[PDB]
Design an enzyme around this catalytic site. Structure first.
Site, PDB file in Angstrom:
ATOM      1  N   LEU A  56      79.352  51.711   6.712  1.00  0.00           N
ATOM      2  CA  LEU A  56      80.765  52.349   6.894  1.00  0.00           C
ATOM      3  C   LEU A  56      81.883  51.331   7.050  1.00  0.00           C
ATOM      4  CD1 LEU A  56      79.185  54.755   9.572  1.00  0.00           C
ATOM      5  CD2 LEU A  56      79.587  55.258   7.090  1.00  0.00           C
ATOM      6  N   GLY A  57      81.305  49.891   7.697  1.00  0.00           N
ATOM      7  CA  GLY A  57      82.309  48.937   8.144  1.00  0.00           C
ATOM      8  C   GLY A  57      81.581  47.600   8.006  1.00  0.00           C
ATOM      9  N   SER A  58      82.641  46.598   7.660  1.00  0.00           N
ATOM     10  CA  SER A  58      81.971  45.268   7.855  1.00  0.00           C
ATOM     11  C   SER A  58      83.187  44.307   8.517  1.00  0.00           C
ATOM     12  CB  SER A  58      81.757  44.825   6.458  1.00  0.00           C
ATOM     13  OG  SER A  58      80.832  43.644   6.440  1.00  0.00           O
ATOM     14  N   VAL A  71      78.721  48.142  10.036  1.00  0.00           N
ATOM     15  CA  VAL A  71      78.768  49.399  11.110  1.00  0.00           C
ATOM     16  C   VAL A  71      77.784  50.254  10.085  1.00  0.00           C
ATOM     17  CG1 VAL A  71      79.861  51.232  12.027  1.00  0.00           C
ATOM     18  CG2 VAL A  71      80.995  48.842  11.918  1.00  0.00           C
ATOM     19  N   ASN A 130      83.152  39.707  10.671  1.00  0.00           N
ATOM     20  CA  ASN A 130      82.611  38.609  11.191  1.00  0.00           C
ATOM     21  C   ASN A 130      81.555  38.862  12.063  1.00  0.00           C
ATOM     22  OD1 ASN A 130      83.419  36.006   9.831  1.00  0.00           O
ATOM     23  ND2 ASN A 130      85.556  36.889  10.669  1.00  0.00           N
ATOM     24  N   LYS A 178      77.232  50.057  15.210  1.00  0.00           N
ATOM     25  CA  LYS A 178      77.850  48.596  15.289  1.00  0.00           C
ATOM     26  C   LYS A 178      76.800  47.753  15.199  1.00  0.00           C
ATOM     27  CE  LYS A 178      81.320  45.424  16.804  1.00  0.00           C
ATOM     28  NZ  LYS A 178      83.030  45.357  17.180  1.00  0.00           N
ATOM     29  N   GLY A 222      79.127  41.583  12.031  1.00  0.00           N
ATOM     30  CA  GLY A 222      78.119  42.324  11.314  1.00  0.00           C
ATOM     31  C   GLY A 222      78.724  43.216  10.404  1.00  0.00           C
ATOM     32  N   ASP A 279      94.638  46.892  18.968  1.00  0.00           N
ATOM     33  CA  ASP A 279      94.416  46.813  17.633  1.00  0.00           C
ATOM     34  C   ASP A 279      94.569  48.194  16.968  1.00  0.00           C
ATOM     35  OD1 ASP A 279      93.539  45.875  14.999  1.00  0.00           O
ATOM     36  OD2 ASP A 279      91.341  45.858  15.632  1.00  0.00           O
TER      37      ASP A 279
HETATM   38  C1  LIG Z   1      83.624  58.625   4.383  1.00  0.00           C
HETATM   39  N1  LIG Z   1      83.456  57.138   4.608  1.00  0.00           N
HETATM   40  C2  LIG Z   1      83.998  56.230   3.555  1.00  0.00           C
HETATM   41  C3  LIG Z   1      83.382  56.536   6.121  1.00  0.00           C
HETATM   42  C4  LIG Z   1      83.537  55.271   6.544  1.00  0.00           C
HETATM   43  C5  LIG Z   1      83.635  54.789   7.848  1.00  0.00           C
HETATM   44  C6  LIG Z   1      83.128  55.879   8.685  1.00  0.00           C
HETATM   45  C7  LIG Z   1      83.063  55.428  10.114  1.00  0.00           C
HETATM   46  C8  LIG Z   1      82.759  56.418  11.225  1.00  0.00           C
HETATM   47  C9  LIG Z   1      82.680  55.783  12.538  1.00  0.00           C
HETATM   48  N2  LIG Z   1      82.501  56.764  13.558  1.00  0.00           N
HETATM   49  C10 LIG Z   1      82.472  56.091  14.839  1.00  0.00           C
HETATM   50  C11 LIG Z   1      82.530  54.963  15.130  1.00  0.00           C
HETATM   51  C12 LIG Z   1      82.749  54.028  14.032  1.00  0.00           C
HETATM   52  C13 LIG Z   1      82.937  54.489  12.630  1.00  0.00           C
HETATM   53  C14 LIG Z   1      83.220  53.614  11.818  1.00  0.00           C
HETATM   54  N3  LIG Z   1      83.586  52.134  11.924  1.00  0.00           N
HETATM   55  C15 LIG Z   1      83.904  50.919  11.261  1.00  0.00           C
HETATM   56  C16 LIG Z   1      85.212  50.835  10.576  1.00  0.00           C
HETATM   57  C17 LIG Z   1      86.307  51.595  11.500  1.00  0.00           C
HETATM   58  N4  LIG Z   1      87.797  50.822  11.498  1.00  0.00           N
HETATM   59  N5  LIG Z   1      83.388  54.277  10.237  1.00  0.00           N
HETATM   60  C18 LIG Z   1      82.943  57.193   8.521  1.00  0.00           C
HETATM   61  C19 LIG Z   1      82.764  57.698   7.203  1.00  0.00           C
END
Ligand SMILES: CN(C)c1ccc(-c2cc3ncccc3c(NCCCN)n2)cc1
Ligand SMILES: [Cl-]
EC number: 2.7.10.2
Length: 269
Positions: A15-17, A23, A19, A40, A21, A127
């Site tokens: 879902l995320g990246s 998500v 430094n 995370k 690590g 942020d």
């Molecule tokens: C549909 N799609 C591409 C998608 C991408 C990221 C998330 C999602 C949900 C989260 N929910 C709660 C806490 C962190 C979350 C997160 N974090 C990391 C970066 C946020 N700047 N990403 C959900 C769906």
């Protein structure tokens, strides 16, 4: 809270990246039901930052802020949160160009409600950006990413940073020039977030270096009105971008303006 690793299942879905690590999407077992979560995960100072981030989230209880489930000490340090499955607001609006102005106003108003609560709680986010606004539904936004957040001292309305990688295009002049972070500095960021939302996730100050952004702002120049943005919404962005921190509105005033405008839009057409 300390969670049991056996009760958590990680998916391949990233879902995320950064430094720190990554998500990843997961599932956690509750008293009876199972909950979809965003986790995370730290790569194997970085550990202390995660525990402080958990400490801040533990203290916040508001519908417009991502809820933390707990921390998991296992193969790595993990911060388990309720998942906002539609993800970041900027990416969502880039992929869904037909979201109405009324719908954007509704979402930005929810962010302002979440920030009014953070301001009342005397925490500074540090942020605030559209990438850190997550959608639970197309009509329900939550503020995430408390990694840089600070609990203000009882005797000061600002946090003074010691060191300087900062999201400079979202930072107020006092942050850049004096390293002072207050709820009014978060209002400036919120004005950038509003521009991003009405620009359907376009990056602010595109093609400009951080130093060129600082110089444009020092000359009293600001980003223009996004295509089809309501005039009342652009006027509020400019108010958020008040150079002098004392004349800039706080989140109670920002939320009230967004509330009155939103309930006026919904009562019309
Ligand atoms: C549909 N799609 C591409 C998608 C991408 C990221 C998330 C999602 C949900 C989260 N929910 C709660 C806490 C962190 C979350 C997160 N974090 C990391 C970066 C946020 N700047 N990403 C959900 C769906
Ligand atoms: Cl930046």
């Amino acid at each position: 809270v300390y969670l049991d690793r056996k009760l958590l299942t990680l998916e391949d879905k990233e879902l995320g990246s950064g430094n720190f690590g990554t998500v990843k999407k997961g599932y956690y077992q509750m008293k009876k039901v199972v909950k979809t979560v965003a986790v995370k995960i730290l790569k194997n100072a970085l550990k202390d930052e995660l525990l402080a981030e958990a400490n801040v989230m533990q203290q916040l209880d508001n519908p417009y802020i991502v809820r933390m489930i707990g921390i998991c000490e296992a193969e790595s340090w993990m911060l388990v949160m309720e998942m906002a499955e539609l993800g970041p607001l900027n990416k969502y609006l880039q992929q869904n160009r037909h979201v109405t102005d009324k719908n954007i106003i509704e979402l930005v108003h929810q962010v302002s409600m979440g920030m009014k609560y953070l301001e009342e709680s005397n925490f500074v986010h540090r942020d605030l950006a559209a990438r850190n606004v997550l959608l639970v539904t197309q009509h329900y936004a939550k503020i995430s990413d408390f990694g840089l957040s600070k609990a203000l001292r009882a005797d000061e309305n600002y946090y003074k940073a010691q060191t300087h990688k900062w999201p400079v295009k979202w930072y107020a002049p006092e942050c850049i020039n004096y390293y002072k972070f207050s709820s009014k500095s978060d209002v400036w960021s919120f004005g950038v977030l509003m521009w991003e939302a009405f620009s359907y996730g376009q990056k602010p100050y595109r093609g400009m270096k951080g130093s060129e952004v600082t110089a444009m702002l020092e000359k009293g120049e600001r980003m223009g009105c996004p295509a089809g943005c309501p005039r009342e919404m652009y006027d509020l962005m400019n108010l958020c971008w008040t150079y002098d921190v004392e004349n800039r509105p706080g989140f109670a005033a920002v939320e009230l303006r967004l509330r009155n405008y939103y309930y006026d839009v919904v009562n019309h057409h």
